Design an enzyme around this catalytic site. Structure first.
Site: not given
Ligand SMILES: CN(C)C(=O)c1cccc(S(=O)(=O)N2CCC[C@H]2C(=O)O[C@@H](Cc2c(Cl)c[n+](O)cc2Cl)c2ccc(OC(F)F)c(OCC3CC3)c2)c1
Ligand SMILES: [Mg+2]
Ligand SMILES: [Zn+2]
Length: 336
Positions: A293, A124-125, A88, A296, A84, A242
């Site tokens: 992944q 946004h971040d 990003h 996800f 972040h 995002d």
């Molecule tokens: C530190 N922890 C662990 C957390 O904060 C966390 C803990 C519980 C739930 C969530 S979660 O947000 O509900 N949620 C569920 C699936 C993974 C994640 C997600 O969407 O995360 C985005 C980034 C993201 C985050 Cl972090 C937080 N918000 O608000 C919005 C976003 Cl958009 C992302 C992006 C790319 C990713 O990978 C590649 F593509 F690079 C990617 O891969 C993740 C690895 C595990 C496979 C993940 C986050």
């Molecule tokens: Mg965010």
């Molecule tokens: Zn973001």
């Protein structure tokens, strides 16, 4: 005059200009933009987007005020946070820029709505600390207390993006009318709040119900009657941008995955040292990057993008094919 050409200072103008030929394409390589812009990808890409869309002229923003504000915003993304950080933000802004020009959405959005979406994506971040909302809640952070545990960081990204407009020579919205400022602020708040993943299931459910009853011109362009339907589409668009990493070329997606995992693992090390339970996905001793992944993609990314693709059909055909191939590739790379 690279400052007049680009956001920014660079000696390798030819190379930066070559990367920016892809400004309107999903295949833009934002890592290379960062390499050729002295690590100012957010300032560089935002200046390019605004020039491309004539937004400085439309909203009477001087190049000096715009560059000043963007440099300050980019400075407020933490370069020691692995994911972040301003690269990003630059990616989400450029991806939003591409999605706004999807053919199914032609002539749908006003210029104020376009300005709002690209600005929301850029901010946004901002000032992300590299730890989650639930970390901040679990540690009784003042930020969590101030926002009652609700969209903690997202509320804070808004507060910082809007506060920086008040810095000397930074008010990019100075020449919008009073009403245009009020409407933009509301739109930007709605789009940044929609990036909180705790809202994802409800966003998607609403988007599906929207696809169910969409109206389309012959030509295949969407008719989005009212404000309420337009901001629904825009909140989902910024959310899709995002969640766009797995839809990019595999060489880009792998780099994003390396970064999100390093940021998760650094959180888990902070948890461990504090005698806290280690959050799911953050324990480097037990993580399964490739399995994670695939999960996800299957549970979040693919259902979101299939719905988006239904709305804008057939515009997102290649995005879905790339996503599916990347899913297969990561699954194939699960060790043994
Ligand atoms: C530190 N922890 C662990 C957390 O904060 C966390 C803990 C519980 C739930 C969530 S979660 O947000 O509900 N949620 C569920 C699936 C993974 C994640 C997600 O969407 O995360 C985005 C980034 C993201 C985050 Cl972090 C937080 N918000 O608000 C919005 C976003 Cl958009 C992302 C992006 C790319 C990713 O990978 C590649 F593509 F690079 C990617 O891969 C993740 C690895 C595990 C496979 C993940 C986050
Ligand atoms: Mg965010
Ligand atoms: Zn973001």
């Amino acid at each position: 005059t690279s400052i007049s050409r680009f956001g920014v200072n660079t000696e390798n103008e030819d190379h930066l200009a070559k990367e920016l030929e892809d400004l309107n394409k999903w295949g833009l390589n934002i890592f290379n933009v960062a390499g050729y812009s002295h690590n100012r990808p957010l300032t560089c890409i935002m200046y390019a987007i605004f020039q491309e869309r004539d937004l400085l002229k439309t909203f009477r923003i001087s190049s000096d005020t715009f560059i000043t504000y963007m440099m300050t915003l980019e400075d407020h993304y933490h370069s020691d946070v692995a994911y972040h950080n301003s690269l990003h933000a630059a990616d989400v802004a450029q991806s939003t820029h591409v999605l706004l020009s999807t053919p199914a959405l032609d002539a749908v959005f006003t210029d104020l709505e376009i300005l709002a979406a690209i600005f929301a994506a850029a901010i946004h971040d901002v000032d992300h600390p590299g730890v989650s909302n639930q970390f901040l809640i679990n540690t009784n952070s003042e930020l969590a207390l101030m926002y009652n545990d609700e969209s903690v960081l997202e509320n804070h990204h808004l507060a910082v993006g809007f506060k920086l407009l008040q810095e000397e020579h930074c008010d990019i919205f100075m020449n919008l009318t009073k009403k245009q400022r009020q409407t933009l602020r509301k739109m930007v708040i709605d789009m940044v709040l929609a990036t909180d993943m705790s809202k994802h299931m409800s966003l998607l459910a609403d988007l599906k119900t929207m696809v169910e009853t969409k109206k389309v011109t012959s030509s295949g362009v969407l008719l989005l009657d009212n404000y309420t339907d337009r901001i629904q589409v825009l909140r989902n668009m910024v959310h899709c941008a995002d969640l766009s990493n797995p839809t990019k070329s595999l060489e880009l997606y792998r780099q994003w995955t390396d970064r999100i995992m390093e940021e998760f693992f650094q959180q888990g090390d902070k948890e461990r040292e504090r005698g806290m339970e280690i959050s799911p996905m953050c324990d480097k001793h037990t993580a399964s990057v490739e399995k994670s992944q695939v999960g996800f993609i299957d549970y979040i990314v693919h259902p979101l993008w299939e719905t988006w693709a239904d709305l804008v059909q057939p515009d997102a055909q290649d995005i879905l094919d790339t996503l599916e191939d990347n899913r297969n590739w990561y699954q194939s790379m699960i060790p043994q």
